[PDB]
Amino acid sequence: YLPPVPVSKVVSTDEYVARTNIYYHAGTSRLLAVGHPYFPIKKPNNNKILVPKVSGLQYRVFRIHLPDPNKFGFPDTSFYNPDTQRLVWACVGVEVGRGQPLGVGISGHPLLNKLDDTENASAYAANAGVDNRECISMDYKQTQLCLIGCKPPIGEHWGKGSPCTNVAVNPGDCPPLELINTVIQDGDMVDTGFGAMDFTTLQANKSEVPLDICTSICKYPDYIKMVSEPYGDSLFFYLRREQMFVRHLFNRAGAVGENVPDDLYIKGSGSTANLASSNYFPTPSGSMVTSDAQIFNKPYWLQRAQGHNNGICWGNQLFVTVVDTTRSTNMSLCAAISTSETTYKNTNFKEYLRHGEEYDLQFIFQLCKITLTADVMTYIHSMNSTILEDWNFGLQPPPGGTLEDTYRFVTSQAIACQKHTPPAPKEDPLKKYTFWEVNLKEKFSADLDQFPLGRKFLLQAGLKAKPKFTLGKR
Amino acid sequence: VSKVVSTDEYVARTNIYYHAGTSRLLAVGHPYFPIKKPNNNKILVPKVSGLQYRVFRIHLPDPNKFGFPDTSFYNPDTQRLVWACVGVEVGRGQPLGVGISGHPLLNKLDDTENASAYAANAGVDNRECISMDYKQTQLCLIGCKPPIGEHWGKGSPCTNVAVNPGDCPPLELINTVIQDGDMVDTGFGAMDFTTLQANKSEVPLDICTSICKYPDYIKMVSEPYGDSLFFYLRREQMFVRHLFNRAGAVGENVPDDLYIKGSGSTANLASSNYFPTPSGSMVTSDAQIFNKPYWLQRAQGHNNGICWGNQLFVTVVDTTRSTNMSLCAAISTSETTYKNTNFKEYLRHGEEYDLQFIFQLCKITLTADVMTYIHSMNSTILEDWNFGLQPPPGGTLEDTYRFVTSQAIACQKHTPPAPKEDPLKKYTFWEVNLKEKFSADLDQFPLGRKFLLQAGLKAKPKF
Amino acid sequence: IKKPNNNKILVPKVSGLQYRVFRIHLPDPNKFGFPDTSFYNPDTQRLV
Amino acid sequence: YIHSMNSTILEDWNFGLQPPPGGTLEDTYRFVTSQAIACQKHTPPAPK
């Protein structure tokens, strides 16, 4: 309804939204974490962990919340009746601080699938034995990237799907592969260049790769999928950098999975008629870091983006994804169980492994208003109705009469508390999805000049009315 | 627009007033329990006492059907008519006197008011025959939605600790619609004794099975439209009389550090539980809230005396008339030497109210906002009106006739399901029909002329 | 009510005879949105 | 007069120091945790 008829050409978010005259910033200072690089340290008898597995290799998701435009007001509001009009945060600019010293903590595995070196063969190697696996480590591809939007980022991975049923499933068959997209979660594992997939399922050996990735299913972001969003709300911006190069050239150790056609060579003799393993694998090697590759510690100013979405954070909500390989340093240390004896005894000493983390979030914001027609209300509810859930705004559809309400009696009880300890209604439909959280809703300064970040923005766009305290000469 | 508005906005007041009312009421029953044939489940006598609550559902006929001496002043197309309730009365004819109740086996230890010596040891089944008076109370409740009560009750405990037999059940606050026949508080609080009291002897008969309930003014008035009640009045009083003990195994011992260990007779701790004996006080002719007119102009809710769906509610409870007349019949009229074996004893109990209602007539103009706002409030209202349409279906049907002719066309007629109108039909309670009783004159009635007297403008023919 | 060996309360002691204090916080009105705030200056002024 | 009455009042507002400059200019905010190994943010007492 309303007079004209439903033409299908979308509006881009700077159509209806209006940019206010006023700006803000707040944010947390920093964060830490420690952890063991390889695996979590737990109470051995229990299943509960004393320590989680932690590394820079872990995708770190971050989700931030903002105060209500209606409840949280501001020094000059003059421009709106809350009846017909509402307000929304807009994200003009973003920072990421990283304060660690830069270095690599690497990793490896105590049993690695390996056969031989293919680089220079001075003799024909032996034949497949029983469990020749060995203890080997490797560096990883270096990577830096940043992700910003109101919907979570969406990665992808390989997986084993169900094959169409023809060949009777035989243990040891080559399993079918399938390419699967999924939401990114916290603690998730960067690719090593060995691909986003499930090793533990798809590799029965489990010894093919270092511990960290062997456990989990690594994921990789899809620009194709994500940016495809005709809203732009998944992500309206990003940057990325990565590098890799080859180091060593090896063979797999195990029974040949799928045989080589013999017509591809000429028949051998002695042990040369015995085909050594044809499965080769490269050795990824991280490269030299630099000071200038950092995509961090530097301001960005995001005005136009690829989607209709322009810098709008719907539902008081904003996301950031961060990937750094530079700070991956894992420090080693030991405490001696006996400090008496003056002779060095490896048994006296238990070496220990911990890892650092540091982070910053500092967020400019510009406030914004919406004028409401049904047309407006149509699209958004059409777009996503949940935004007309939390925010009525003030209104259900333009009648928007109240609900003959339930006003809550749960406030304290007799130890009944299923007025809910099985908690309150609605949800985050993504609440199941684990990832890290911070509330800023308390922090906002009314003027920027207090902070190092902001004044840059005052500097960047220049000062219209420069701060004047009538000090200095009069 | 959101945010409910004062009904006097869109409603307009007319120039016409009407009156109707029942002739009267007179009720008889047994106070303590209902009577039924011993083998049968059918009631021989219904249980009746003043202590029981009284609900009154009062229908009105749709005024839009009610032709006026001049109907021209409105258009039946664009508009409707809905009744406004200006003023309300409650008649009571019984002579004022107080009833009473008790129980033949009452859990009791001893008198705690004065003790010259430490008590004895609890035996088995020391319960006694003792009675007490209930708190005096008067209240009145008026509105277009059912009066909302509340009570304590047992909820589902947290599942952590395994409940052993005799453990303390957790407690819960439970709203419900108020039903007729339910019991006033005795001062023992609104809850279900049946569930939370296994002894069944902890209170006098009348309330033992039922659930005493009490109106929660907050949640009631908390309704946005006020349609639960737009008005009320309340009076009650109580004072203490006796001080007793519960007799039974102690559920939870007192921490010893709260006292000093005794010895001999003082070694055993007497029952810790005390419960009061509530007492009604002197009744008076002055505090009666009945037999006197009321005038409802402005209420707490945005609803101003608007009765939606031709429906209006009255909830009235009083203990002042609780008088229980006792009577006796003789099984043998011969002997002149009296014998207690000769007489059967019975208890019957009277009840009398009366109802007279003013009404004012009101028209509603429509727009979309109007139509929606109501439909927002309660859409069932428009159903009883003629607006909301609702195109029907129905292209074709195949009648095959005839069916009892047993060449089989299928087996067929399945659509009774919607005589159903009252959603509260599950709730049984007192009923009255005024629909016939309207009249267009306030002069011929005792009540009405006061309405004129108050607002003035006596207008009567000449003689 | 408390577990007999424990020091932790099983049930809180409650009776009408107990006094009741109520502390009531308000949020700072100097952060708080008004349909029109221009009637004052947040610099030279305050709100309580 | 206010500072006479109760000085703690001026703290909760702005107005940290007597005429119109502003600021408590040593360093302010810090957090050392997230997940649980290192001895918690609450090993130090609550200052406020």
Strand content of chain A: 15-25%
Biggest interchain interface, per-side counts: A-B, 21 and 22 residues
Which oligomeric form is depicted?
part of a larger assembly
Gyration radius of chain A, rounded: 29 Å
- Strand elements of chain A, count: 21
Instruction: Please outline the major beta sheet of chain A.
Output: 5 strands, antiparallel
Structural class of chain A: mainly beta
Percent helix of chain A, as a range, is under 10%
Helix-strand topology string of chain A: EEEEEEEEEEEHHEHEEEEEEEEHHEH
Q: Separation of termini of chain A?
A: 62 Å
Walk me through the structure.
In chain A, 8% of the residues lie in helices and 25% in strands. With 474 residues, the first copy, chain A, is mainly beta. In chain A, the strands form 7 sheets. In chain A, strands 1, 5, 6, 16 and 20 form a 5-stranded antiparallel β-sheet that branches. A 5-stranded mixed β-sheet of chain A has the order 13-9-17-4-21, with no helix packed on it. In chain A, β2 and β3 form a beta hairpin. The radius of gyration of chain A is 29 Å and the shape is globular. Chains in contact: A-B, A-C, A-D, C-D. At the A-B interface, loops of A face β12 and α4 of B. It is classed as virus like particle. The entry lists the keywords HPV16, L1 protein, asymmetric unit, virus like particle. High resolution cryo-EM maps of Human Papillomavirus 16 reveal L2 location and heparin-induced conformational changes. Chains A, B, C, D: Major capsid protein L1.
